[PDB]
Amino acid sequence: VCQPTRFISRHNIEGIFTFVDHRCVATVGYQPQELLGKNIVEFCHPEDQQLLRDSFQQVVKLKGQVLSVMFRFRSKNQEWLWMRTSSFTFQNPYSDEIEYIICTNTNVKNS
Amino acid sequence: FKGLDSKTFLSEHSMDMKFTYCDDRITELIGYHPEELLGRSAYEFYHALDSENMTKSHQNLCTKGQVVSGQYRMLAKHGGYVWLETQGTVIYNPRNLQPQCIMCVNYVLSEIEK
């Protein structure tokens, strides 16, 4: 079957990329170091930015369950690609360090 | 002593638990390079005494969508095993609830024991 193009990321609760899987190059055309330290919202279409912010805000409230969002992500070639991001929080349960967000980011169709 | 970040590694699997991605934090923990895991089932690496439990865990994960494993032992590259726990989450297609892959957050609980 045709494997969807996707990559994993980790974000702080504000949306900053703190880890980026190198499959990002194939998915959106950036090297990991072009994403790391930036907010995901900096890659998001203006119409979808607030949705994406509010998704990040809520996913910490959902008891670790997955929250999905579809948004337009600006590729390295400055083109809008539809991405479905599936996100959930994690915290090492032996700690009280602040949760972070793990995302799977897949290029999908809007059709 | 190691800090928390160093004792976690993320992995992605197909629905049969074959590795499709692993972060490089695994190497310092138990020796493997990510590239050598790809296409191998996680089941190859489970201790014999944890195998039936991990099969049940996987079934529960596929039924429920998200599970925390029991403690289990994972075979290290150079011998011995490390105690792990894994939180698994199925990633779907929202359209039709078709499963796409399994995202695992793996955290160690011991040094390599042999």
Cα A19 from Cα A21, distance rounded (Å): 7
All structural domains of chain B with their residue ranges: 1-114
What kind and span of H or E run contains B29?
helix B25-30
Going by their DSSP bridges, the two strands B99-108 and B8-13 should be labelled as antiparallel
Count of CB contacts below 8 A, A vs B? 42
Cα A21 from Cα A43, distance rounded (Å): 16
CATH 3.40.50.12780 for domain B1-114: no
Residues 6+ apart with CB under 8 A from A33: none
Q: Which residues in B14-43 are b (16+ Cβ under 10 Å) and which e?
A: eeebbbbbbbebbeebbbbebeebeeeebe
**Contact assignment for A86 to B65 by CB distance below 8 Å:** no
Cα B33 from Cα B49, distance rounded (Å): 25
Burial (CB < 10 A; 0-12, 13-18, 19+), residue A91, is: middle
CATH (one of 3.30.450.20, 3.40.50.1820, 3.40.190.10, 3.90.1150.10) for A5-111: 3.30.450.20
Amino acid symbol at B37: L
**Contact assignment for A66 to B66 by CB distance below 8 Å:** yes
SS3 at position A7: strand
What kind and span of H or E run contains A32?
helix A32-35
Cα B64 from Cα B58, distance rounded (Å): 10
Going by their DSSP bridges, the two strands B72-75 and B99-108 should be labelled as unpaired
Residues 6+ apart with CB under 8 A from A62: A88, A89
The whole-angstrom distance between A21's CA and the closest CA on chain B is: 8
